[PDB]
């Protein structure tokens, strides 16, 4: 309204609303996460079991 003859505030708001999703998120971590978790968990479990066995020994 402060721009009385903008003649583009309609167009600018149109582009703004139509650009509500410029793009999407990228949560592509769905098997890389699983593999990293598997490797880390197996290694850490081996470490913890080894530590407990060392404590017992």
């Amino acid at each position: 309204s402060v721009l009385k003859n903008t003649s583009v505030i309609d167009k600018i708001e149109s582009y703004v609303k139509q650009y509500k999703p410029v793009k999407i998120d990228a949560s592509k971590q769905l098997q890389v996460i699983e593999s990293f978790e598997k490797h880390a968990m197996t290694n850490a479990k081996e470490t913890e079991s080894l530590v407990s066995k060392e404590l017992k020994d």
């Binding site: 583009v8 582009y15 793009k23 999407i24 890389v32 490797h39």
Partner: protein, 89 residues
């Protein structure tokens, strides 16, 4: 007042010629209607990003970077490297 009324007349009907009537101005050669209304309306985008500011160039956000889901090669080397780093713990 006559000096007020006459001033109002000469400053209104002539203001009509300048703005309130599309008669431009006879005293001034170039009309502002052929100068400001459209071309200088691009002056706003001349100071702005031309065909780009009102446009707001499409730039979709991209994906972040990751390991390409590669545990066949990166995992073993990572494990060996972390154990080597553990040698000075």
């Amino acid at each position: 007042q006559d000096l007020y009324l006459r001033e109002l007349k000469d400053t209104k009907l002539a203001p009509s010629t300048l703005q309130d009537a599309e008669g431009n101005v006879k005293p001034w050669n170039p009309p502002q209607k052929p100068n400001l209304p459209e071309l200088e309306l691009q002056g706003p985008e001349a100071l702005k990003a031309y065909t780009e500011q009102n446009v707001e160039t499409a730039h979709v956000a991209k994906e972040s970077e990751e390991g390409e889901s590669e545990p066949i090669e990166e995992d073993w080397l990572v494990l060996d490297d972390a154990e080597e780093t553990k040698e000075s713990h």
